[PDB]
């Protein structure tokens, strides 16, 4: 019952508040939990294993829809299972239509699944290092960069680029949770000549910014972004001034979902962050809304930097085909 | 008398043959002096006869070199001055709805007229003296610290603008040479002598460098009726790149470069010169079949222009229609 209590603790942590702060920690925890589910649970065929994984994935995704990394890991494990079963047993395209199965047992499938999960974890470990390594090809000397909020990938990007180049960074605090101050302090401690501003100044100073480098929470199927609130205005200003918008996002933040799906997209938190409880009687008559995430259309994004290199949003669909099976979108 | 005719012939021959005077300010001053001499050293009875004489002289001077719009601008300014003086000293405009809802002759010689006109012309000449300094004085309210300015060709007004701004602030200026007459090198070295930290490049790199440029400050040869520009070649591309990157485009141009004509005279708009500058005569037999065109001016639509800086201050391209309505009379456009 150790696995059951681990699953319950994970679900409760997802529901109440994020234990693993970094998304990489969440992905690693999900992968470890899925590995324990595969090993400990007793299954004969591949189909029953897939349906079990689907059940726990549905529970975990229902725990917190905004946290898409859990669902991404579940779907990656499902595609790994499908690929291994196909390899040990014997893609919607025009070629397939013109040219032209579970419930079979294979004893050695489990070891292949386990080793595939292990190599997936190994790849997961070094994503930020790869992004930082390729950072130096996009920053030139005496450049001006703009960042919104706090993202570890972007700060690693900038700190690796700062070892050989001198550039200016402008960080806009992400109100109400003003986490841009922490990133600005961290970058200033590395001597990167940073500046702190509020969101309201973004369009005021974008005319003097050479390029924008941002992180994200989720990349959708069409190349759209689920980012921190205020990123849509940032992208609109960048498009207005034609400054390139670079998104430093690893491959596990890539979700096969589409924008218009149940409208449970943004995450709404207590209005105490926006309007304090000490205002008084006016709070009876005032509707306060505090979204924490924002939708960014794919046409406002210039480039995607990931552990496999640089890509355009127009190619994102292909990265969907190589990662998730079309029958695992619904989960 | 005879000396006036000799001066007129010399002026028209200098206009139609080559350069002279060097600067547009000097050309405007010479045109105004010639017009003053015509007004004084000639006998006319009515104001209409003086207007007809000025019309004939201006027609000849503009036919000498249509690309030099400053001569026509001075002629039309003198005609407007004559109209204003006759109206003020005879009775007590601009074809508005107000005049249409509330409902001429230029005879009746009045003795006090002529002298008054001369005075007005002198006033005009006075504001020709401090025009460049007036434009340059307001450079410190458009340049901020560590800015990146970009310029095309050689412009004395822009040179004075930047040299006055550099006395109290540090900024970077990129000059794109205006091929074939690479006059941007002279402006670049002139700015470098003032320690403005200037960069030189060919004007094929305008779009590549526009991504790192904060403001574009350029001169012009003529401002058209709708706010359009007749500028050196490559200015239309520069404006297009600035509009693509939404970098503000500032035009530093005096008030005597305003021409009441519209861009529908496209045939004579550009000044086509010998193709020797583009393709040398030493190419050989291929010159027999190749068509080479070397325009020195091009048309910039008003929608690509952000601001107009002149000796009367800053303005938007949407207000140009008013300024010319205060400078020229509608019946004097055709001349």
Which fold does the CATH topology of the domain at 131-322 in chain A refer to?
A: Rossmann fold
- Portion in beta strands of chain A: 5-15%
Q: Report the count of strand segments of chain A.
A: 10
Look at the structure and give the CATH class of the domain at 131-322 in chain A: Alpha Beta
Instruction: Decide which structural class fits the backbone of chain A.
Output: alpha/beta
Measure the end-to-end span of chain A: 25 Å
Major sheet characteristics of chain A? 7 strands, mixed
Helical content band of chain A: 40-55%
CATH superfamily of the domain at 131-322 in chain A: Translation initiation factor eif-2b, domain 2
What is the CATH-assigned architecture of the domain at 131-322 in chain A?
Answer: 3-Layer(aba) Sandwich
What is the element string of chain A, with H for helices and E for strands?
HHHHHHHEHEHEHEEEHEEEEH
Name the pair of protein chains with the most residues at their interface, and give those residue counts. Answer: A-B, 7 and 7 residues
Write down the overall geometry of chain A: globular
Using only CA atoms, what is the Rg of chain A? 22 Å
Which strand order spans the largest sheet of chain A, edge to edge or round the barrel?
3-2-1-4-7-9-10
- Quaternary state of this entry equals part of a larger assembly
Distinct helical segment count of chain A: 12
PDB class: translation
Keywords: translation initiation factor, viral protein, translation
Entry title: eIF2B-SFSV NSs-1-eIF2
Chains A, B: Translation initiation factor eIF-2B subunit beta
